[PDB]
Design a protein that fits this description.
This is part of a larger assembly, with four copies of chain A.
Chain A: E1 23-27, H1 30-33, H2 46-53, H3 70-84, E2 88-92, H4 95-98, H5 108-123, E3 127-133, H6 139-145, H7 152-168, E4 174-179, H8 181-190, H9 215-237, E5 245-257, H10 262-285, H11 290-296, H12 305-311, E6 317-330, E7 348-351, H13 374-385, E8 392-396, E9 401-402, H14 415-433, E10 438-444, E11 458-459, E12 463-466, E13 472-475, H15 477-485
Parallel strand pairs in A: 1-2, 1-10, 2-3, 3-4, 4-5, 5-6, 6-8, 8-10
Antiparallel strand pairs in A: 6-7, 9-11, 12-13
Helix pairs in contact in A: 3-5, 7-9, 8-9, 13-14
Chain lengths: 491, 491, 491, 491
């Protein structure tokens, strides 16, 4: 109630299900855990500004000023990873902490911080997988030219990435240029619920003076161009030993046809093209999915021949951030339907219930995460069969425990999260058994953190953060299972 | 609301989907439509007695005294079949109308009635498929020795069947000895909600002085023995031309394992063994399913060598009455569980919801009919792959429109019934495409009728019966579709 | 004559067929090879007592007083393993040699012996896989309370296991709590042909004052409870580094339905449930197979909630001792059949011939080992598809050369054993190719030994033991093939 | 003993398993049942001569002088067919009864006889399928030029066939030019156990002055040329209405590779090429199988371009005479092996036992008929997948009950024959389900008859012939089953 059936004992994953090279880890992002938002020379980011200017846009009126205070307590994050036996830590670098003005003088204090974290991880036999940008744009660039809505962001991002390569590249050998470009474009410029908070006039967001049918595509186009420039530079000057890898992480939802009909089968392909293909196809073949160009037209920027060439094959590794799936229902083209939100351009509605009226899967806590591990296996096979089977890492996967949920009264007894994670780890095994080149699984939420517009009300961590006890780290049931799973020796 | 998605236009069945020999028809039963319960010498049946003695046991306080008055209006039933283009009419013969005292003197008026119906059907090019017994036991035999709980019922039934063969066998060439033995044993002697209304002391039924763990099996054993004796007689003296066929109709529910586990896979097999195998396996191999004997033991009567021989291969045709499916959930054997109802002996609970909390399919009106056509195809393939692929007729299939259901305000606009029927007709096509020897589809409910303990509150007909307008027959939307489906010429 | 066709040259296994982590080895058991039955403080076991009290119960009137004298010649066993290039040696620890009185004072001489063997194996780069109990019960405990028929055996076994963990756990990292519980219960308490030699009154065994329908189940229940207690202790205090593994070894026969019929398909499942499931299902889900509980009832002890929890998932590795297969033929439940031997409870007879009258496979020497490698692959896939695909080691596999067999005049020319082993190694490869997690193959019979009730008349070794030449070890043809297979450098 | 397991009750074929056009029948041949060997002007055949000159060559010293006396009692044969409900009767025409001198004057009495049989069959709604030649060569032609060893047989056969077409073609619309050419060539000219009884000098046959490596091929070549000429004439002048069909009946054995090896897979193909392809491939593509030409060379006659053209596609229907199967074992080419019998040319030995030493199937009575219905289904699929799926009739199928077999003491209780026939009828159903164009099943042995070199000692009939009671026809258990199977009305 809600009925939540767990895996049978003989269906629980064992580390042995994966080969010696497979990597289990956990993830976080700078704004969501660091805190020290204005400390040691750090400049403000678009999220600092968004929260400080429109605090009401965060569900619980909180922000990332302190978060889990990882700027000061990062050693406790490393300890948590070690205690669970994780082999990888995926974290992000704060652009505004390294370059307070977006461009210009590098903040040595910022560089010193990440060097300490990186060196501690290495000293503890944990491999760092670094995300360069995680929605973390310096407000200085937003003020100057509108951030990602202006072409100038391309070179500015390139120079930021270069600072990262030069200072950390000797130890960090695995990078992700951008995190969830589709989520970012949709929520930051479509619905405007995320920083900078823009949307079309008449819509409900902080700054309703944008264009939900155009700004999302403009921003995404610049993200892709910035990615292409950064990768070109990386391969040319920062991979001299040929042992480094760079790619990007995509937010992806699985999709099933709403009804048994060729129409919803077509709708499903449009949904995947829009959710995943929007950014994946450009890095694979050098252009957006044909479905998107045919439906968005002039609102979707064209790539030059040189740009398409730089984009194609620009990812050594693909990161997939998977949480849930939806049913895709066909929408006809007619004067009765007129797109107003960018997501309308897919002509496929995302439904939580199918043709029989049933939810796609059990709700796990927060309103949008319905459990459907099959959707992940299906996406992994699409990567294998359609896009060339590139190396794939599940860069994010997990659930939230929500404040106020009577079914989750003890924050440490996260048996639901554990079952969900075990089921998805098993779904990854299924994909590997079928030939998919999946290299790792990183649980989103090494620790509870700032869940953007929902604040701290949503806890995604394997490790609890006791906000009333100095942000102390406490392993949850799920974290303890990983300790056993990873055969961590006991004291 | 409840969401009821319909088939797409190109998925609607056409008569051409089936070969020229396939037979579409409709079904009814004597007590449910005839009326004239005490007319022209007819004696009382167990249902006349049950309703007249415990009227409160029928939901709407109604009974079959008049029903659809088919004793007098049978020509209107024939007309409805003709108007829909049906090729078969499956109806039953009232034992108490033919033999008022169970045994003894045959009631000529009763014989004349069925002869009129049979001759009218033949004159209208409709083939009669006759059910000899449809829960219709003469109360005289119930009073004398407890009806089906006594061995005497075997010979008495045999003599009744012989009267039917002698008087109608020259025109009727397809018979069903018994209808839904599993439903009958469960509801008449287990829960006791059906005539004679018996159950264990302490339970809620009209006559709580029986034994829900024993009487159901005793009754079923006599049904099988009576069937065996009647078939032996039929093949020996009433099939001289070798063109007649006899079998029985089984109520069957489809089953899916509740959860992905070998335990529920085993539970599912026990559910099928109990629901279908109880009576099907004896007519196929001469004995009850091993699962039942291992779990019921001394409470399940043993068959003699001669009886097993007479039972094996005793059916020329198999009738399957299919309406819905359930999830089967394993129940462990332990001192914590003690059977009290015969259905408990399967050690598999029937659930309407699966491991994810979702209903197995859309509710269609009455509380127990969840739409799941896949379950039917699965059962048909079990008949093919496990039991030798004998000739199978879907002898009943349909849904009820319930009085008071705000989603069904117009009794003639039965688009839900139509969609359900089209989906199951398509499921039969799927089975045939896969090699199953399915010979016909008979919709349960040629006309609205007395739905046993629910009275007239549940309307199952393709044809509406206007109880306030002299029981007038009015074709519903579904019936009109059949007219088109069967290419009936228009006036 | 008997026709024994060998594999074609291109079908012979190569070490390369398996990955670098796969482990090839050989096995023995304490009573079967050690000798020194009363030396250096060792107390008598149930087998010492059985042989000394009822010598006539051993076919050739021999016993394990000296056996292969491995107590003194263990270095020759290590040399044989080294000469063949084996990477693993599976041997057992003698309970009575370590704890002469079952409980109490540990015999240092016993501890010193196993330490010498373990250290020699390690010095020779051979990994020790240790079986804690191999039918080896101290007669002191048999005298005191009836050994495994009394609950006291649970804690006594636990303390014995602890002695093993404390003294050898620093080097031994792979354990098997019990060997062939099904064989043991069937032969020691059912037919009574094995120590302590008990069976029902009227039957032919040494001590016909037991109960063949109850004692086998009582003993098996205590074996499972002892296993659960030992594993709980192991995981809690003797796996601090998390690099050790513990499980049990099951004797298993493959099964094929006797005839093409759903009845024999059901019989086959009952046979597997009884032969393998009896002990495997409890360690997988915490309870006996449903089929067994439904057929054995009160004669099969119930597990408490806590016990089921301790049993479920109690094995890190599964050992399968495979030699042959049988056809399973359905037996009906009726007053004409009454169980007298525990094996009768499966209601499935094990036949050496199928419906066409043909043997399941070629006889290999001893009367019960018919060659049918397909049966092994089938069982391995059941482990994979039904029980979660846990790590499986073929802990025993091989054939016997029998004294007096004119087709085997030269004990060293064991081409039949070699072909049989090659065929089963290939069958394991087939299972691995199909996804089964098989980790190794240990040939039963590193050396010829005491084959229980058949004495030395059955030779199972890869290495011959010349009983008339001081028990000298001589490599047979099969052993020499392993030297080549394992690429052992030559002198 | 010998173990003979029967089909389960639900596995017994029903007429409904096949469509309305499928034809069930029985077969006989002229010399085997007619008698009247020298009556009404009939001339002697090679079999009359063989038996009368070398009576010792028939096991029981009998012959076809009287046989079942069908020349006089044919109406009883028609009655037996009618009583069983058979729709087809496959019989042969005696060349020597129609043309006593092989060529020349037609014997009107002979023509009148077959006209009576044909008209009686038609009056009884039974379709006649006529075999023109069934080893029945006129001794006049054998004396004149060596029968089938001389090219003159081609035109002489053509003129005989024409007599049949002209006199019976108005009612007979289905013909088979020759019966079992492979059996005939092998036994009549290879081993010489059949008339004319020729073999190589030194071998044991009536006339050891032939050549077992050449005469079989010479005879077969003339059979094919005669077939081609007869069919050309038939299609040109005796199928004006286009409703007649002509082909030939081939004796065929199923084959399985002796051992799991590509060598025996190749051997199996050579066996099929030799047993079936020898005569089938020429009528399909116009030439012998490549394997035969590569191995037999100059001993296998070459076809001219015109002959290959006349042979290709010369059969409207294919008759397969199936009884058993064998394992095919590869034979290497080397100076150690030199062919002496024509069958040696296939370089594949036919074994009754496989690599495991087991018989291919249960023996059914006579020494050569091992039951293996799978072999038939396999051959039918080869016809479908390799040779174009032409219309196939099982023109012969059955078993013999042997005089002296203690397991068959009552000649009428042929439950073994019945089970065998039911299993093969089911195997035909399997082939049809898989797409094979099988049009009928004719049981060999409408009545017990003269089984060539084994005399009457082998009874193949569905109907018993009581030789001591005037050759009276008595239906056996199998025949009675067909009456039920075919729904024959009872008296």
């Amino acid at each position: 109630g809600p009925v939540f059936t767990k895996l049978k004992p003989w269906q629980i994953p064992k580390r042995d299900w994966f080969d010696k090279d497979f990597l289990f880890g956990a993830s976080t992002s700078a704004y969501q855990i660091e805190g020290a938002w204005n400390e040691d020379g750090k400049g403000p980011s678009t999220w600092d500004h968004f929260c400080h200017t429109y605090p009401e846009r965060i569900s619980d009126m909180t922000n990332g000023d302190v978060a889990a205070n990882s700027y000061h307590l990062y050693e406790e994050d490393v300890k948590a990873l070690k205690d669970m036996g994780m082999k990888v830590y995926r974290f992000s670098i704060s652009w505004s902490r390294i370059l307070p003005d977006g461009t210009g003088k590098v903040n040595q204090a910022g560089i010193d911080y990440y060097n300490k974290l990186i060196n501690s991880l290495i000293d503890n036999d944990i491999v760092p997988y670094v995300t360069i940008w995680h929605w973390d744009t310096p407000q200085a660039l937003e003020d100057k030219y509108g951030g990602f809505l202006n072409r100038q962001i391309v070179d500015d991002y390139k120079q930021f990435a270069e600072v990262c390569f030069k200072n950390f590249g000797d130890r960090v050998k695995n990078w992700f240029t951008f995190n969830e470009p589709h989520t970012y474009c949709c929520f930051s410029y479509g619905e405007g619920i995320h920083a900078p908070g823009r949307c079309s006039p008449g819509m409900d967001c902080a700054v309703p003076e944008g264009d939900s049918l155009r700004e999302p595509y403009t921003a995404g186009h610049h993200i892709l161009l910035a990615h292409a420039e950064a990768v070109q530079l990386f391969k040319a000057r920062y991979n001299m030993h040929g042992d480094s890898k760079i790619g990007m992480a995509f937010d992806v939802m699985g999709y099933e046809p709403y009804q048994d009909s060729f129409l919803d089968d077509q709708a499903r392909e449009r949904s995947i093209d829009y959710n995943m293909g929007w950014f994946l196809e450009p890095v694979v073949r050098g252009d957006y999915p044909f479905s998107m160009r045919s439906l968005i037209g002039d609102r979707l920027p064209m790539f030059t021949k040189e740009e398409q060439e730089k984009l194609a094959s620009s990812c050594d590794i693909m990161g997939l951030n998977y949480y849930t799936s939806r049913f895709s229902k066909h929408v006809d083209m007619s004067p009765d339907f007129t797109p107003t939100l960018n997501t309308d351009d897919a002509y496929a509605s995302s439904e939580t219930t199918g043709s029989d009226g049933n939810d796609i899967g059990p709700i796990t806590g927060t309103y949008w995460i319905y459990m459907y591990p099959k959707g992940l296996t299906d996406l992994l096979l699409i990567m294998k069969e359609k896009y060339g089977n590139p190396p794939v890492f599940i860069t994010e996967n997990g659930i939230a425990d929500v404040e106020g949920d009577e079914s989750m009264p003890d924050p440490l007894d996260d048996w639901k999260r554990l079952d969900y994670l075990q089921r998805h780890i098993s779904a990854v095994k299924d994909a590997i058994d079928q030939g998919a080149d999946v290299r790792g699984h990183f649980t989103w939420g090494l620790i509870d953190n700032f869940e953007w517009s929902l604040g701290y009300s949503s806890r995604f961590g394997l490790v609890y953060i006791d906000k009333n006890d100095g942000n102390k780290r406490k392993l949850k049931k799920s974290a303890k299972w990983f300790s056993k799973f990873n055969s961590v020796p006991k004291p």
